[PDB]
Amino acid sequence: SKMNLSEEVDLEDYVARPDKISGADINSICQESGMLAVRENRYIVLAKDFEKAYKTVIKKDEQEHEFYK
Amino acid sequence: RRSQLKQAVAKMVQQCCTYVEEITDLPIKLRLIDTLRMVTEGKIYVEIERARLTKTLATIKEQNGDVKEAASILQELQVETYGSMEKKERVEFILEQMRLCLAVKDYIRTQIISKKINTKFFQEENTEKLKLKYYNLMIQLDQHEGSYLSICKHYRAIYDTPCIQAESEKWQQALKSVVLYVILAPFDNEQSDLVHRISGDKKLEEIPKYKDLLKLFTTMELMRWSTLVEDYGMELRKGSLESPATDVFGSTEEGEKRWKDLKNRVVEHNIRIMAKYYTRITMKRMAQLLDLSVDESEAFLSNLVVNKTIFAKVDRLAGIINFQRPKDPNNLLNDWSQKLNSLMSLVNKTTHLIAKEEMIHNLQ
Amino acid sequence: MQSGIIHAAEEKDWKTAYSYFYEAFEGYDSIDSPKAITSLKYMLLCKIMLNTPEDVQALVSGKLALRYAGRQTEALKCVAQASKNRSLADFEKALTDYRAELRDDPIISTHLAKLYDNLLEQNLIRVIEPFSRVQIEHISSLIKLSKADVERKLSQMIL
User: Which residues are in the PCI domain (chain B)?
Assistant: First the structure.
């Protein structure tokens, strides 16, 4: 609610994902997307910011070795 | 980004200024829409809103006035209340749309946004006309509701830069409207000292009629209305300061309402003063002194007493109004003890006088 | 919604029922207007029943309410106007004006009597307060009502 956060950004795309993050990572997600927007001197945050921020925070490679299944 | 877009967009905007004075609306709307897509980026801040202001002017003038186009400018004001690195032009920016809001007739939003530059005063240090424009709007705003004291604050704020009072031809009504509007306000301590401060001014002498009005409304017992209207109802159309007087007379609704307000003011003054002096009073004497029917007297004082303004307890059966008759069985000898203290102090003080005076006669 | 309706049915509490109705509105929030409108009407009438009309006027002033426009809100706002002015003629006038919905909800008809009685007592205390001993005919004329019922109400009040 504190960020301008554009108008067209979609949040349902991120809540529906599965990754059981903690509650102190949501804050870091939003903070990081904001800083990403500040870097390029644009003062409204866009969707690509959220995408790259999410990928930056999570960092889970695969851990899904397949031939067991 | 070292001007790599600022120079480009500035050149394109000056091109737009050159074409718009000759080009038709069909192409110029498309040009503005195309040039607006780099507004959202930030980083340029200025030069993006000027296009917006020009667009607003164009879309007003094509219809010679519109309300939706006014809505096209409400959003970005606070956005660039801090975008531009300049004081004056943003002030002009965020007061210009005020008149648009007034044309739309939205008082609440207008006064919400008006809070922005109240503390950014002294914006006139090089442009008095801008300060005058700022003060000319609230006089219109509060003229809608009933507040009758803030407008005096505004007019007393037109006591500014002597580019205002060095032009007596309008300065007259400048200092007349303040003394006419102070009277309309209901009695209170703030008015009690405002009438005092507005009075006691040297050049105020230059007009005798309004000086007389203030003198009458400062003292005690007042008039029966009839004589006052016969003695001041005609000066409201002669002279060179009657334009606020016209405002009090001209508009039918406005004039009628303000007559009603002055009427209520005088009858209220009568009530307060007689309650200050009298103690107990009959019905018919009240009706006779107020020059109106008994029923109207009762109805008029009813909302007064329910307002916790006058401490009265009318008893209808015998019709004896009874101001200032609370009574107490513990206060009595409080008063008694007070008188005792004063008497002891006074007898003390007399003896010093005795001694020092006998000193200058009987030393030898 | 159903929980709030049952809660207010037997007339035990209003704070909890209003709470339920607000969170149910958050249930209808931004996904279903046809039920959000009736949620707002229930919210406003419940808040009126707590003798909090200025609360209603401020609350419908909110941006969320500004989005959910309507015409029933005019009816509720005028009823609040009548309540904070303490007038029985005003409330009767508002009832005549918006009889199409006020006397349309089955639930409203139950609570109308109690709200009427409360308004009557408040109006009478305002009218008779400003002074002392008085003939009953004047107060009867002022309230615009017959005699006998008026002094019966005065007796019940003083008792």
Answer: 150-328
